[PDB]
Amino acid sequence: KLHQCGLPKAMALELFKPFVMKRLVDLNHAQNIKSAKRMVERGRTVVYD
Amino acid sequence: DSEAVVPADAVSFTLLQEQLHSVLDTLSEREAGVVSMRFGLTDGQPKTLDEIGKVYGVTRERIRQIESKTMSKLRHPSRSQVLRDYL
Amino acid sequence: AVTSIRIDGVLHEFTTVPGVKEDVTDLILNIKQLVVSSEHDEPVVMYLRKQGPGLVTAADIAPPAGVEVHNPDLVLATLNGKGKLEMELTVERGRGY
Amino acid sequence: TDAALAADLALPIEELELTVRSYNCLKREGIHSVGELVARSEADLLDIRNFGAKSIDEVKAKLAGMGLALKDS
Amino acid sequence: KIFGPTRDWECYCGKYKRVRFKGIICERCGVEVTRAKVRRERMGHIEL
Amino acid sequence: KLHHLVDDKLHARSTGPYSMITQQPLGGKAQFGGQRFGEMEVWALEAYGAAYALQELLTIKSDDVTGRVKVYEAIVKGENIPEPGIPESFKVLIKEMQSLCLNVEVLSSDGMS
Amino acid sequence: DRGIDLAPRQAVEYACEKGHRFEMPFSVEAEIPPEWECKVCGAQ
Amino acid sequence: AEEEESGALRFGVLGPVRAWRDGETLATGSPQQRALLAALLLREGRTATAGELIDALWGEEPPSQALAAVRTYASRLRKVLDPGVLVSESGGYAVRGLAEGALDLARAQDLASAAEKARSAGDLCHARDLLRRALDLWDGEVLAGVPGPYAQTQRVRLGEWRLQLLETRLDMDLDQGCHAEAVSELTALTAAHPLRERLRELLMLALYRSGRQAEALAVYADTRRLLADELGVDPRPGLQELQQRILQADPALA
Amino acid sequence: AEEEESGALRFGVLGPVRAWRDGETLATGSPQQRALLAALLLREGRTATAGELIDALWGEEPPSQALAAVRTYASRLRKVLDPGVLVSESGGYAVRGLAEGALDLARAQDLASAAEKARSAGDLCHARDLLRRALDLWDGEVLAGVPGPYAQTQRVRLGEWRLQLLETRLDMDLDQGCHAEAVSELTALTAAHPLRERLRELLMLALYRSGRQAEALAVYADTRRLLADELGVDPRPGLQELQQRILQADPALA
Amino acid sequence: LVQDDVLSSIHIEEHEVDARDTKLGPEEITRDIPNVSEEVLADLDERGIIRIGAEVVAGDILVGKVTPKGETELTPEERLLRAIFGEKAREVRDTSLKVPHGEIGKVIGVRVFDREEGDELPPGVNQLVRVYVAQKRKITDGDKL
Ligand SMILES: [Zn+2]
């Protein structure tokens, strides 16, 4: 649409990294911030969801 | 530059500070108190077994045994995943 | 189709097998045109062993029971006097690419 | 009382506090919760090997202390 | 001594390594124990 | 097939290495550097009249030795973004003007600094 | 930095030959030096 | 008696803890210092610190003079034993200068290892003799009059080891055909220890091998009803396999 | 005794730290001197600075003029040891000139690596002998009677590493078929170690393959009760899984 | 043009690191990397080199280099944690050469230059390692033709 842009998975993951870490902690997919950072750097499918 | 503080490192340090107090409060009050009086934490200087045996008033063997028990309890894998990745 | 292979003495697809004029990537290209039929749902290991000079093709391969090659005239590689090729081609079943 | 029923269904068998015999007999079959044993009928636990009438009476008294009962009983 | 410590809360002679007794003047060398970023703000001068 | 491959052009950064002479991020793909927000970009944001986005792109997302860490903490902990401080490059400019024998002093409403 | 107590400080007064007087903060456990460099003119 | 070397100091911990010199016992004294001597002796020459000794001996709550009490017990042993045997190193107390075969536990372990080597080499009679000599070293109850929780743990460990040695000697005796004393020993231990199921399995093997069948099935039924009443599992696949081989009259076992 | 080379200097850190010159022991000295020797040794001859040595020995609160204390400790080491074995580099000390097998920690590392390699190769007797040699190295608790936070950290690390060594050793023992000794020594260890879950799982699998079941599930029930009392949580799912597969009488383990 | 391997190319990237002799000590190329799990260093050689033909992704360990030591100022919290878990006596630092972000390839070659051998090296360094990673890039979005 006119208000939409398509970002790649890696680029959007790198831009939104702290937001993804916070949401991973909130949705209890990671025990803490360090585990969320490790999951983000590894690049699993739950990180992309 | 290496002197620049990494935001991720500072966030991890603050989360460690918040998590260690919580896992100390998970233990009993007396065990958490003697651990916090034994290995730094609340007070910068770590008081030795002799230096805490006057304010609490037991033997060296009793305080050493309960310190070893607290170390073994904290070494159990149940209270490990909250602090293993903190290094 | 063939989904994975393993050449003896080769660790990755960027080396050259000692004694063939086509490198391993050209071998990947030649294997990728090999049309096969596999009755087994599980992957099947086919064996291709050639010693001495000659022209290794799809007719020289050993298809197990239930797996059949269909273009035996497809040339795979060439071998000089000191050439020796051993591949274990894994074949699987599916649709698309 | 719905939360009380959920709690009485949720706690493990270790809080049931009966002997090792019937506890082992029910844990062999795969029962690890009070609600799982409740959902089983009478013939379900009288088909258990090495489960005598004394075991049934002890279990019945145990759940009777907790205020709940068996299925079809 | 002039521009502040290059370390954090340390000083030149090696004494006063900890953080607790921050903001003191070392008697051996005169280095004030504070953060290293003080070197981004602290200047001196040359007499001609 | 040209050598403007997409695997080499793509680069992203949230927080990485920072420069030394001034505390802004450094540049480049291999060293995890940030994109440059030049003068014309700042003109475009003033033409929109978006003071807050411009301020956070100039003071929060670079050039602040304490704002960046506090903002990262606020994002990680979920709380609101703290107020921006003073960019470091302005302080470096003040220090370089002071060593050219210019008594450049900031003034508040009540007095000096 | 949250809960840290600074070592007790004493402000020791140094005066040079030129009349400049200044206070330097030292620790209580610290040994007070009789000699210092003047912040104003660099003299003894 | 053939190894009674002059001047050799020997120790006994497999029963009541004692010290012998030239065949004459030494005044061990108080049971508390006897427990300390046993704790030093049971580590097979490994050094023990004073604090771990206190924790092992007096449990969880020692009184206010634990260190001095341990020190004076060690001093009393120093007068009792040789000065060169009990030594102080790194704040702890250790037993050194121990000769080979003087300690009953070390001698029993060496004899058990030799018996295992002989069994691997096929020498059943030599292994039986060696481990019978090792089993003769047990002087009744392990650690008689020895207080402390570590004493209880060591009692359990050595009792289990002795029971397992009796178990393997029994199976070796069943394989050797000496079932006459084996039946009596197995009945006595099953009366003493109903809890062990491997021992009852060897008893069932002896019952089937010696030639009576119906009372062997009575023994199996007794084991089954005991298991059902106390614990309630089905019989284990090894026990069921032995029972069905016995019921089928397997000529390989006979 | 077969590796006793002439001129070889041997060091002992896995227990009480000691120095051995060609078979005769040397007076190591004060406990802080012993801890300094241990700190200089465990770095495998790497140069440790004097300030770091102070931090290792004493921690956070050192006395002001006590760098000369470390200086005189190093001088006393050079008195006891060779002039050239301890070298001064960049204001710190390093113990160099050490041949292979001189340090017991390096010997334990090599023995563990060889045992892992033989596990990868499937050799049971060779790795069993290697681990038997490895377990005959440390005597008692590691770093006995030495102070310092570095000493405490090394103590707890080497104790944990010894725990995993015992776990792997006795898992291999259950793989080869050593029931009795494994059951006895793991009963002793779990009496000593009440909350070690891996050793208790080893007890479960050992007793499941040894013919003993009642005390196994008794120990398991005690484990759950103590883990709920002291921690308030559930044990690891692997223990529950292996207990469940024990309950169904799976003949794969037997 | 993707399935028939028409528009695709092999891209080989070289990336190197050197173990030097700094003031504190000599940098070591070693397998025993601290503060890392065993599965991360699974594909390393005995001396700490990724094997030839080992598929590697972003963030993976290529060659294991550790710095000898750093000014140590442990916090009481980290000191207490260290007591629970235990740490390496050496206290070396993780500065091993990792894969850059967003890179996938197959290791096709490693070159090692040693000072102790006859190989000539720049002053200061003790050894040097170069690793080549080769990827067969197909044609994708954004590729300029
Ligand atoms: Zn100073």
Author numbering:
A (entry chain D): 437 to 485
B (entry chain F): 424 to 510
C (entry chain A): 50 to 146
D (entry chain K): 239 to 311
E (entry chain D): 50 to 97
F (entry chain C): 1017 to 1129
G (entry chain G): 19 to 62
H (entry chain J), I (entry chain I): 17 to 270
Give excerpts from the publication.
Streptomyces coelicolor AfsR is an SARP regulator with an additional nucleotide-binding oligomerization domain (NOD) and a tetratricopeptide repeat (TPR) domain. AfsR null mutants show defects in afsS transcription, as well as production deficiencies in actinorhodin and undecylprodigiosin. It is presumed that upon binding of AfsR to a 22-base pair (bp) binding box (afs box), RNA polymerase (RNAP) holoenzyme is recruited to the afsS promoter, allowing for transcriptional initiation. We find AfsR uses its SARP domain to engage the afs box and make extensive interactions with all RNAP subunits except ω subunit.
The DNA scaffold is engineered from the afsS promoter, consisting of a 44-bp (−50 to −7) upstream promoter double-stranded DNA (dsDNA) which contains the 22-bp afs box and the consensus –10 element, a 6-bp (−6 to −1) non-complementary transcription bubble, and a 15-bp (+1 to +15) downstream promoter dsDNA. The final cryo-EM map of the SARP-TIC was reconstructed using a total of 95,223 single particles and refined to a nominal resolution of 3.35 Å, with approximately 3 Å at the center of RNAP and approximately 6 Å at the peripheral SARP. SARP-TIC is an open complex containing a transcription bubble of 13 nt. ΣHrdB R4 is positioned on top of 2 SARP protomers, instead of binding in the major groove of the −35 element as observed in the reported structures, suggesting a sigma adaptation mechanism like M. smegmatis PafBC. A dimer interface of approximately 1,120 Å2 is formed between the 2 SARP protomers, revealing a unique side-by-side arrangement. The 2 SARP protomers establish a total contact surface of approximately 1,300 Å2 with the dsDNA, resulting in a 20° bend of the helical axis of the upstream dsDNA at T-30(nt) (-30T on the non-template strand). The SARP-TIC structure demonstrates that both BTA domains interact with the αCTD, burying an interface area of approximately 660 Å2.
